[PDB]
Symmetry: C3
Subunit: 150 residues, 3 copies
């Protein structure tokens, strides 16, 4: 397979500029994906993640809900569904926003694996998303290969 799901975590948007950016990048990179699910912060992120993992896809990309603001629980919902975490990839994604956006260091976004599915939390701004996608460009294919055992 070479499939992907996109989840946009935003209570504000759910009643979005990042979804089309991610969908285009996935298209550009050769992935098939469904229309992004735009969901409210918190439990709806978890439900969306569960739905996507049950679709049996290769990669799930989330955007939004990763800072320290009251409603930012994307990383916590992501921790609850993964088998394990990839802390170096989450750090690379943070560092991709530096030095130009100092607040990049506040992002709590994680990366991990749920079975055979790689999950990556991106920032909730278009710039951050593009920064994070540049990092994934350099590793994603190798990551999916490694995940599948070559």
């Amino acid at each position: 397979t070479r499939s992907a799901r996109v989840i946009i975590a935003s209570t504000r948007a759910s009643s979005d500029r990042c979804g089309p950016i991610i969908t285009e990048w996935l298209a550009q990179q050769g992935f098939s994906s469904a229309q992004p699910e735009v969901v409210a912060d918190g439990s709806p992120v978890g439900e969306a993640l569960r739905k996507a993992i049950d679709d049996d896809v290769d990669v799930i990309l989330t955007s939004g809900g990763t800072g320290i603001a009251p409603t930012d629980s994307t990383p916590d919902q992501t921790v609850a569904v993964v088998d394990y975490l990839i802390p170096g990839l989450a750090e690379a994604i943070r560092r991709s926003g530096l030095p130009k956006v100092p607040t990049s260091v506040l992002s709590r976004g994680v990366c991990g694996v749920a079975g055979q599915t790689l999950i990556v939390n991106l920032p909730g701004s278009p710039g951050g998303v593009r920064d994070g996608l540049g990092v994934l460009a350099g590793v994603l294919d190798h990551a999916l290969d490694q995940l599948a055992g070559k």
Copy 2:
């Protein structure tokens, strides 16, 4: 509010050069703070943290007790009181001591949030404290804004 508490973790000092550095920086940065609490390693750090969180302040800065030496439990006491952690900020603080102090990578200091209070573990040397405070200079105001929901 724009309030702060300082905790110096040192059994040696508790029976300190970092406290006045931090108090000055907080003054310089516009925060009101109380005289730093100088406490012994371990449980007294936890108690100090609890006291400060119960004071309802915006930021708690600790210094000391973050290495790998037997009595270094500041990070462990900090993990036990926070609701969540901000691993990118703790990494930024480490990296602020590099390349000049290679042992900066051994620091276990964490950053996190307890309710509406941001907590940041700094190193126990004046140089490390200054290095860490330079990092906070670039983000602290934005972090507190994000924490409060703008």
Copy 3:
């Protein structure tokens, strides 16, 4: 003491080029060590770690089993035996493979302490091992000193 144990995690090798590299480096650095234990991924890594910790040595270096491939459980076995972790040293080791090996960010290797024993997960390729050993060259002696209380 100035003692070390080496564990090579590889099901493929266990029925190895990294072991002799590590043994030479330890010799070069003044450590006494035993012949590296080459073990299969998973539970045998845990057993090897337990055996080494029970030998009462100053440092344990592992190689292999740190990526995201199905059988890569070296970090998980290492987490289960340590008293605490040193996340900055594990990050330094990752960053030592960048920018030349972008996939360095996928390594889940950890560093930690079990009692008085420092444990460091290195990558499973000779290049990565050499990259990680360069990092340890700059800090290991100070780390062991700090661990012992000067």
